[PDB]
Design a protein around this ligand. Sequence first.
Ligand SMILES: CC(/C=C/C=C(C)/C=C/[C@@]12O[C@]1(C)C[C@@H](O)CC2(C)C)=C\C=C\C=C(C)\C=C\C=C(C)\C=C\[C@@]12O[C@]1(C)C[C@@H](O)CC2(C)C
Lengths: 193, 41, 196, 152
Amino acid sequence: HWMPGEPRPAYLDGSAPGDFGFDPLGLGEVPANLERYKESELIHCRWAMLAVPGILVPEALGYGNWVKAQEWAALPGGQATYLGNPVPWGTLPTILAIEFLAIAFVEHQRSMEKDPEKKKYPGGAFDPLGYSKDPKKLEELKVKEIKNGRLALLAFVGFCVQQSAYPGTGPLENLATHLADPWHNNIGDIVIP
Amino acid sequence: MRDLKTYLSVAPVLSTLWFGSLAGLLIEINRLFPDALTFPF
Amino acid sequence: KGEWLPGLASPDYLTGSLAGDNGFDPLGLAEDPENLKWFVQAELVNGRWAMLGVAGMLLPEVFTKIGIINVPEWYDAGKEQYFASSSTLFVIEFILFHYVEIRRWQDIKNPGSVNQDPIFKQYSLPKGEVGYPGGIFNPLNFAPTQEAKEKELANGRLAMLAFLGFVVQHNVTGKGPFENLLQHLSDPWHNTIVQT
Amino acid sequence: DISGLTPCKDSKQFAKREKQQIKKLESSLKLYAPESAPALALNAQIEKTKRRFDNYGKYGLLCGSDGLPHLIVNGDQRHWGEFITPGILFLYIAGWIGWVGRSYLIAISGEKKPAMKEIIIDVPLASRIIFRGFIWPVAAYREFLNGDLIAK
Ligand SMILES: CC(/C=C/C=C(C)/C=C/[C@@]12O[C@]1(C)C[C@@H](O)CC2(C)C)=C\C=C\C=C(C)\C=C\C=C(C)\C=C\[C@@]12O[C@]1(C)C[C@@H](O)CC2(C)C
């Protein structure tokens, strides 16, 4: 339970993976709506569990924080760089065109699916190493995936919010600032100026 | 007199007494503390 | 039990089964039993906090007669510098009290639902009443008889009135609660609320 | 300086208004003997005018270009005494009155002829109910929680 001593909603029986009865607003009441929400939650989690490695690793290599990498495109004639090496095709309208076409194809391909189970765990070719061979291990794996995804989502929210309070700074910079003087460099000063 | 007490509880007499006392209180309040534009405390 | 005003009748909903029941409810707040259930806990918590507050506001000023320590007055204790900033201390206090008071709150809704330790499952509070947890909160195993509960409630009410007096006196006199007592004891007939 | 306004104490037009009012009051006093009662009344009026202008200067009001005070009601803490505190006091008093009226109406609803208790008030019951409205916020909020505030 997400809060011991609280009654559960009737539609949250505790059989779904990562089900702890958290629904104060009752957004999952409609059975057709609740089925969609699981797919969206899994997609959000999987997208956020790739961003977190992609935000810290470039900053840990001294290539600049994650908001500095987007500054050049606002300028006229800015060219993209990767690992300190400018890429020949890093012009703005070349990047925008290739991104839209490549993504619009795969997402529409996902849209046309009509089996509800395959929209969450499609299986098949996307599981080359065959970790889904055991139904007993698979449930534990699903619980692990759901538990990690929500943590990554919370980490991304922290990434976004910490930027507003310390403009122009990276998360590792904020951690280094906190570590030096914990008792005066923390959240308290921001809340109470 | 029960009937006299009943006549004192009728709506117009009671309203007149209440409003007279209220107006007196307000007049004295404005007499003690004249020209109040803001609540300073 | 006793009457707060002889010659008056007690309310029907105050049947005397509660601790410290003297039939005092002129304004009829506790007519609804749910209101009574909430207000009992509210009174308990308010009295328990006010007792500690008064004890902490009075004794650190009684030192002047004995001269052990040197502590600023209760209304100047905040401005003093401490090892951590005020914001950090407030944040930590909020973080801990949120969990503590949410844990306490769940017992009022559904009694007996938060008696089990969340991390070490082999540990649990013995079953008791709503406002009297017991268990590790009662290490000396003093029996919670009705007499002790009545004493607790009386002391809590007295301490709440004392705290209200402590607050009001400082706004007018501008001095400490103990300094107000010595001045009164110097010339009792000239040093009252009526200054003249 | 909110909205380009200036404090009353630094406003020259405020002083000019005060001087004009005092001079107008003083021209009437020359028509009467100093010992007469109308002279005393005019002296009291002049003193009251000076005191009012001084008090307006002390409270930190804001004047425009005409030398007249203006009220800020946007919620700024520097001007909470202009709108916020009297508003809260009025809300408390109005809630008291409404709660007392509702309580009296509910009290006599179960009688044989409830209409006759509306044209001829039952004084003791109203007097007992009058004191109860002093704690109207708590009672109203608890009634809202219990669901007894709205008729079914
Ligand atoms: C908890 C409490 C106060 C706690 C204070 C604390 C902890 C103080 C801490 C501090 O000091 C220290 C320790 C450190 C100091 O340096 C700093 C601070 C931090 C300041 C007060 C409760 C205070 C509560 C009070 C006063 C309640 C009064 C209620 C009354 C009288 C009700 C009367 C009625 O309720 C009935 C009986 C029936 C109704 O029907 C009829 C009526 C008439 C309506």
